[PDB]
Design a protein around this ligand. Sequence first.
Ligand SMILES: Nc1nc(NCCc2ccc(O)cc2)nc2nc(-c3ccco3)nn12
Length: 291
Amino acid sequence: SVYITVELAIAVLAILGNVLVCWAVWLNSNLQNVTNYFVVSLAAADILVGVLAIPFAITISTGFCAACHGCLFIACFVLVLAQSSIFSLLAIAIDRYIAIAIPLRYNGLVTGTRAAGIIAICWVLSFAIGLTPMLGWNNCGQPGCGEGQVACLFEDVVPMNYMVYFNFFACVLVPLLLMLGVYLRIFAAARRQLKQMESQPLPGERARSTLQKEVHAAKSAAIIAGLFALCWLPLHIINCFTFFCPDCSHAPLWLMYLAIVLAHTNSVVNPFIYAYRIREFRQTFRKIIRS
Ligand SMILES: Nc1nc(NCCc2ccc(O)cc2)nc2nc(-c3ccco3)nn12
């Protein structure tokens, strides 16, 4: 019960923090742009974490008895929310890129409609991937609870060749490498703009000020995606240790818990990172609380 509380504590903060981020975008129309449409997808996702993921994660911890479908769901649901966030964070990455790179075509391309469409597909593909073990790629009955029900234990029910080759390497590592690659060009061309506006026979502080803020938002976005990888890589690397190195000390349960917990923490930093990196956001939250 010493660690049980921690998981619940995180669940609460995850719900409040993001429901606040969602309500703030519903009151302040100065946040209701195409960009923040994806932010909500990330928020709503990190909300279902403290609402479902954590409640599930803490359940399958001690293990239980239920069918394969029911078990795999309570075991692969967290893979969905995390996978959805992969799409969102990648979207935001491309978003800030289109804005800084092609400011004019930004409005003609990055529309509020296409935003909704993408988000929808992101979740659809999020379930297709996150629940792949349910498609048949699972270990239900691969050497108590009686016929029908299965001893719902993560390691015994969820494949490793999947969460490594498929999940991590492809559906997480590759995206992060793409996201990284994006922010590479973003901050690369951004400073080129400042260089071109340095040899100009005119002030034009409108371009500079606006750009520096488009960059400020891009940087703030980079800090968001950065925390994700920083709060998931540990758990994934562990899976690579247990998998690729069978003789290597199988990660301890206590260290395994800590690592798994860290992932549940990524659903809490976003609210605080907005109220910190975004002056527009913090002022909105302040209004809500006071009033
Ligand atoms: N190797 C491994 N073992 C387990 N075992 C379940 C142990 C456990 C489960 C829940 C909890 O709160 C504390 C401990 N869960 C695991 N979850 C993950 C994981 C999730 C996302 C990426 O890796 N890997 N993994």
